[PDB]
Design a protein around this ligand. Structure first.
Ligand code: CNC
Ligand code: CNC
Lengths: 483, 137, 483, 137
């Protein structure tokens, strides 16, 4: 298929469907007619799109963990515990990493070995191997909406199965589930395959079935500047809306400075809505998700609660629709059900301790919002220019030319030139600009902020500071101050 | 220290990349020739690199949890490739979840790894161990 | 002695000292000449007053737990653990409640029972019984400054012993260590006995020995409106300054609305400094202490961290000089050394995750500050009027007339007429004014804020809402919503 | 249900007052005549109020931790005072620290307490138990 930012026709999509369903035998379980009726029988309380509308209506932040294991009954018991003992508001099913490379052979071996060992040897739930039947068992066993959370460049078959499975949200996008997760997939290919995933949701919406989509904001989780993160999320929202998506949650990963983070989430929501309406998408319901600190965690569990709950406070005051919960096991391994419930309980307690509270506007907030919107607009403007009006083609070219560049992204299609680092108040800034297309004024502000850190620490800003910042939270603080 | 070659990568379907960059930086700074094959690397790429570059050691990082599956069989493949006795290190977050460390360490040694490292291991520990094992301090 | 707000003469003070030292045989261990030289040999790192100046200079919030047990060696091991494993910045010694009623016989029995039980049967350290010798053993065994934390209407002998003991701070005041802690002690008598405690620090400062004093801000810890709390602390700061105290930490207990709490602490510090200078005390170094949530905690330890770390975030953004740490055992019993270290670790992690960050000014913050300063001034103005310029006499008369009235205070000298409750955003407001001397404008603002809660909840504002608010945090949330 | 008198207070050197107000309020609303002697109450005050008011029960609250010392001896004093068999309840946070609740409960029943309550006991539990013990449930 050629890549263009244009809704697939029904015939185009159907032809791709027939190919995709053949990629594993559980594809035969997918019947779109039957799935529409199944989906429409789900109660609103178990529909992710509808519960997001409710959360917005009520001015509530909802909490959602990460969770998944190889075996179906074990996965179900886990989610029920997060629901009942943790008090989760939304449930995930974190998909294993073999599924994410379409290696269902390795998933199957992992299922068998997990059975034999009495414990999960996979780092998630192999949704394609469990099929529509297995995915429905999960949904039927719980009492909250379900969402696939993963990191998959080619998620077409997974999307078919989990949506026919009654899971009413799918996380990802053609940039955010490529560059942080893959080394060898072209941007064009992952954009095309994510157009499929968006178009499937577009089909369902056309039949009256509401299904949420969540571009993955945090990307590599590692010092991602707000304007670059937000440029990705806005782009993925626009590309999804073109295929017919109507309920979108845009996301952001915590950087740690409360005013920068609130600025970032507010800019993200405001510019997502602005861009959607400017491009004629006038019926899209936008929500936000804030991810608690996606960098390295301290090993000490008490210190981990310090990160979890400060993160939550920032989310709450930002007016996030959703917050993704970290646990006291984060530095060590996939949390037990108890550790995860602990993180969810700490989070919800913090949210309820802050009911209705929002950060009021200040000069500082206004200033940082102007900075983020200007930086973001520079990037998006250049993308539209490179694509001669077509944002999908603009995205491919932006990656090729370093205009879009994600810190630490393993993809060989990522330039790897731009380098981030914190300023003296812990705001993430641009240390090396690469080919990111900012004005000198914009670059100047970044350098001015960073020079304050050089003066305070008595060392030049540098890659050693970047290293220091990568380790800082695991070592007990936000900013990687000297020894 | 005297100059020695290591192969470094992240195994299986694992995309975690930041520690790979730090390990490369640190072992390079210590005076090793680091042959970094990067992320999402199957066993065969580790062995091909070791052969092409006459490596002294192979450092397998596994962060995403599926190390138990991914790491099995490497020692035998190395032997078959003629890398008998090569040093094999494994570290990161090599099993799913918090576990009793002495059990995990024996499991990976029984798989043929020479050294096995727990979560949050500093690069410097590995550097010291490898100098010791290579008789270069 | 008659009560007036005038510095005791040297003769007057000495005559009282000779009486006070006879109240238990360890009084014979206090030698003022020897104690000045002992104190002057303590390194600055272990001087509470000096470390507060440092914290202010560095723009750091320092963390301090509560802790104390009956036996000397056990108490030392406990504090060493909080220092070393917890990372405390300051050390307490929480004094047992028998000591607080001058029942040294019951302390002695308690020590004997604790030895025999192998565990503390006292709820603190019996400093008067352990004497100067025991108090010095504690100081010599630790590497941080030491402060007596307690709740004692007649603290004269305790103060003599702990200061000669090298503890370079004493918490308390004649209001804050009476009304929340006693039933039958007159306000005049506790004011007189706290003039002694302040005058002793005045003596030491005249010899060049620096000792901090901390009025106890939170009072009953139960829905105390900021303006009433602050009026008490400003009064106690002024009464201390008149006796020659030069290093003062004024305190505030968290109410839970971040903007209210930051407003409260800023107002407290600004008006403390304003009042000190207006009354000619021009050399007093003022710092602040924010106490994490002093009302009931949830039993669930993960939820407890929710409260601990949200509270710390508020302290950090407020610019508090010091924050007092709660633990995951708060709802159940005096923490183990491990539970206490856990609370300190979570607190310090949060502080370091927020290094240098401050809440910026907003219209909301400005508005709340103006409300709190006006309410506070109203109370202080009336106190000065009742005392015909003398604030000590004014304080006695203010309690007699209900001008000053502390919610839930057990003291029979507290009117018990004013009733607090939260508004719809969780700010503590005045529900029933009693004789608190506010103008109608001030009263109507409180009423308007509360009517918003009635509208939202669909119930009239009432004492039932007060009850609900008392239980809310223990039940998982800040505001006592119905059902 | 029908009319009955309790003595309520907080024992020893304990000044905690909020729960005392809530308990007074709750037992009063349930129909009891609450003789509230308040905080910082020694044993003798509970006994003197119970005599003067012909109380059916004494509800001892202890929050500050020294309950184990403060509560010892009350039953004997009640006996010596002519209040043999009076109902004696104790609750709050009656020992120092988190302890194994069955051990603690046993400890205070051995002191002569009829009923012993853990941290965070709702007033409604004590009200239902008193109604049952007074045969007015
Ligand atoms: C950033 C991050 C992290 N990740 Co991801 C998550 N979420 N993650 C990500 C992002 C990575 C971006 C990228 N491409 O790099 C992101 C969001 C994409 C991601 C994704 C995933 N992650 C996943 C998981 C499971 C994990 N991830 C963690 C590693 C979870 C980490 C949790 C944590 N707090 O540590 C984490 C927060 C921090 C990792 C990091 O960069 N640290 C900084 C880095 C410098 O240190 P390091 O990586 O630990 O490496 C050092 C040491 O381990 C040591 N070392 C490492 N290898 C060796 C080898 C030798 C021989 C020696 C001597 C030393 C070492 O030295 C290194 C250099 O200093 C994890 C521990 C979190 C957890 N507790 O659940 C967990 C592994 C679980 C386990 N082993 O039981 C996912 C399945 C999603 C999920 N369920 O949470 C998914 C899988 C992707 C894939 N295909 O692999
Ligand atoms: C508010 C509070 C609290 N306090 Co003070 C502190 N910090 N405290 C204070 C303040 C009291 C103000 C006042 N005059 O009322 C304040 C700050 C002055 C204070 C002071 C002190 N406190 C002290 C201590 C140790 C304690 N305090 C707590 C009670 C610590 C509490 C910890 C907590 N999270 O619960 C606390 C935070 C909340 C208490 C409260 O009001 N709850 C609300 C109230 C409605 O419920 P409640 O009191 O629990 O009572 C209910 C139930 O227990 C039950 N119930 C109670 N009694 C009975 C009896 C019967 C028969 C029945 C059926 C039911 C009951 O029903 C009640 C009504 O609903 C404590 C559990 C905190 C802790 N974990 O260390 C602890 C007791 C420890 C133990 N038992 O092991 C001090 C020594 C200081 C310190 N080391 O922390 C000091 C002692 C003063 C003294 N002389 O007694």
């Amino acid at each position: 298929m050629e890549l263009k930012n244009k809704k697939w026709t029904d015939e185009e999509f159907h032809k791709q469907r027939e190919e995709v369903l053949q990629q594993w035998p559980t594809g035969k379980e997918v019947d779109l007619q039957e799935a529409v009726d199944y989906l429409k029988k789900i109660p609103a309380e178990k529909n992710f799109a509808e519960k997001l509308v409710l959360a917005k209506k009520k001015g509530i932040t909802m909490a959602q963990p990460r969770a998944g294991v190889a075996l179906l009954d074990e996965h179900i018991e886990l989610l029920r515990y997060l629901q009942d003992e943790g008090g989760a508001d939304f449930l995930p099913s974190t998909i294993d990493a073999y599924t994410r490379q379409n290696r269902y052979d390795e998933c199957e071996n992992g299922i068998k070995e997990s059975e034999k060992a009495g414990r999960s040897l996979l780092n998630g739930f192999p949704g394609v191997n469990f099929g529509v039947k297995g995915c429905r068992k999960v949904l039927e066993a719980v009492n909250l909406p379900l969402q696939a959370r993963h990191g998959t460049p080619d998620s077409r078959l997974l999307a078919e199965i989990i949506h026919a499975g009654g899971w009413t949200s799918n996380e990802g996008g053609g940039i955010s589930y490529n560059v942080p997760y893959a080394k060898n997939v072209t941007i064009e290919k992952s954009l095309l395959d994510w157009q499929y995933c968006d178009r499937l949701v577009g089909f369902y919406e056309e039949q009256g079935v509401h299904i949420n989509r969540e571009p993955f904001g945090p990307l590599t989780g590692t010092l991602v500047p707000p304007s670059m993160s937000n440029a990705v999320g806005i782009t993925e929202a626009l590309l999804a809306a073109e295929q017919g998506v109507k309920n979108i949650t845009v996301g952001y990963g915590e950087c740690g400075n409360m005013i920068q983070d609130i600025a970032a989430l507010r800019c993200l929501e405001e510019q997502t809505n602005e861009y959607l309406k400017a491009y004629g998408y006038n019926d899209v319901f936008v929500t936000t998700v804030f991810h608690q600190w996606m960098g390295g965690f301290p090993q000490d569990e008490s210190k981990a609660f310090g990160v979890i709950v400060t993160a939550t406070t920032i989310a709450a005051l930002a007016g996030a629709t959703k917050v993704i919960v970290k646990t006291p096991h984060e530095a060590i391994g996939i949390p037990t059900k108890e550790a995860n419930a602990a993180g969810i309980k700490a989070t919800k307690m913090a949210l309820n301790m802050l009911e209705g509270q929002r950060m009021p506007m200040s000069k500082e907030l206004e200033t940082e919002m102007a900075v983020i919107k200007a930086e973001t607009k520079c990037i998006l403007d250049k993308m539209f220019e490179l694509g001669k009006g077509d944002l999908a083609i603009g995205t491919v070219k932006a990656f090729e030319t370093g205009v879009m560049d994600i810190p630490f992204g393993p993809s060989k299609y990522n330039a790897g030139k731009m380098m981030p680092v914190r300023d003296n108040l812990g705001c993430v800034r641009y240390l090396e600009f690469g080919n990111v297309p900012f004005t000198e004024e914009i670059k100047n502000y970044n350098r001015e902020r960073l020079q304050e850190r050089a003066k305070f620490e008595g060392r030049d800003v540098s890659f050693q500071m970047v290293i220091d910042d990568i380790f800082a939270v695991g070592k007990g603080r936000l900013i990687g101050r000297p020894e | 220290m005297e100059k020695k070659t290591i192969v470094l990568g992240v195994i299986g379907s694992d995309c975690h990349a930041v520690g790979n960059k730090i390990l490369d930086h640190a072992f390079t700074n210590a005076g090793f020739n680091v042959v970094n094959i990067g992320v999402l690397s199957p066993q065969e790429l580790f062995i091909k690199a070791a052969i092409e570059t006459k490596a002294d050691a192979i450092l397998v990082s596994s962060l995403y949890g599926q190390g138990e599956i991914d790491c099995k069989g490497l020692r035998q493949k190395c032997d078959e490739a003629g890398l008998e006795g090569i040093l094999l290190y494994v570290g990161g977050n090599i099993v799913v979840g918090k576990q009793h460390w002495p059990d995990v360490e024996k499991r990976f040694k029984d798989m043929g790894y020479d050294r096995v490292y727990a979560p949050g291991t500093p690069p410097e520990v590995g550097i010291a161990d490898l100098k010791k094992d290579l008789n270069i301090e």
